[PDB]
Amino acid sequence: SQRWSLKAKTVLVTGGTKGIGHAIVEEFAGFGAVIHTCARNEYELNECLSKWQKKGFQVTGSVCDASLRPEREKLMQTVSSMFGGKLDILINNLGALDYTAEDFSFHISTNLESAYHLSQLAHPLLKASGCGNIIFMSGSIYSATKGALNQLARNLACEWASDGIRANAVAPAVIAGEPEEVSSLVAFLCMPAASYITGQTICVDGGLTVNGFSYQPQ
Template sequence: MQQNRWNLEGRRALVTGGTKGIGAAIAEELLTLGAEVLIVARKELDVNQAVTSWRSRGLNASGMVADVSLPADRHNLIQLIENTWGRLDILVNNVGTNVRKKVKEYSPEEYNFLLQTNLTSAFELCRLSYPLLQGSEQGNVINVSSVAGLGHLRTGAIYGMTKAALVQLSKNLAVEWAADKIRVNCVAPWYIRTPLAETVLQNPEFLKSVLDRTPLKSIGNPEDVAAAVAFLCMPAAAYITGQCLAVDGGFSVNLFSE
């Protein structure tokens, strides 16, 4: 019984944006802990390569090519899960992107693009997945937010807005869905070595400024976020819901230090 508290044997999980960076690490972590994982991403080659690699190691992975910012693709994804599994134990809303600009420089198209990708996709997938999560009786939703949703960062206001909204969505759903035995939490990473972050971390001065503000003096790895997500989905975390766990090397509690 103690062992079962610390694995995900028999769980069925959906991870969006599951071919690269944090999403791929989350899928890997859930798979190695015994879950069956469906990843979704926009590029067929990336999906096929990831699934083939995991299956070659005996891991129970599958994939679907879809853009979860599009309503039709979201409905097709949920229909696949309903037809294949009939329930969903874990939903990880990981898809996210950014356009780094000042507020006055954003176009309406960029604004809508960021909201649809980062926020609407997660909100609608939660709603569409609700009956499947309810059928699990041990459902979990993990929304991948960011420390940019907890305070000001130079990542851009729209990105921060969407990430803050994911924190609030998690709190509301945690209460609204508690009676259905669905737990809802989120994680808030700081700079993690992903393709999206590397574009700015390649600047030595910027990297130094990040490290100077991080008590652990290091950039996080995708596996650090994946471990937090996996823990929140485990039976060992059964009394945790509505929380936002910062995976940030202490950045969010550092404030101003000498």
């Protein structure tokens, strides 16, 4: 039906050349969505774009270091011009001899800033779509980042609902199957069929029970 279709929906997925981001691009491409992605290494971008267009996938890309403010502004500029000022889906895929406090601080703030800024740059585009979706896809360092990201996600969901923008966060399992499998949940959340789903922070962990009591990632 039309509710379970992502056909011709415009998507921006950061870091689409590898890992979950690459799996997310393919998942959406399988549904006939129009995707734009980015990466720092232009040759690997070229490599993926090549292997994709042959599979009949509608994907374009640009070189970008999403950790840099000016790079994020240019990226969204490229996206607005190619999608005609409208963007249906934004997949904020965060980047993945012992880390110090400065390292801890830097990685957490770089991740949180890129995701926050990217969402703000896309806001007007997402608003013009009339049915925009944002997905935040992202130990110790990761846990704290995830904790911050979930909150931002829940805030934007309430803050931008009147603009018709939904926001959800998704995390791969801690205890496992390929973690890339989560791409299908990401896709479902962006379907009209899931228009009432917002503010969710889902971790598809295997989970565990002790003495009959369940335990899951916090």
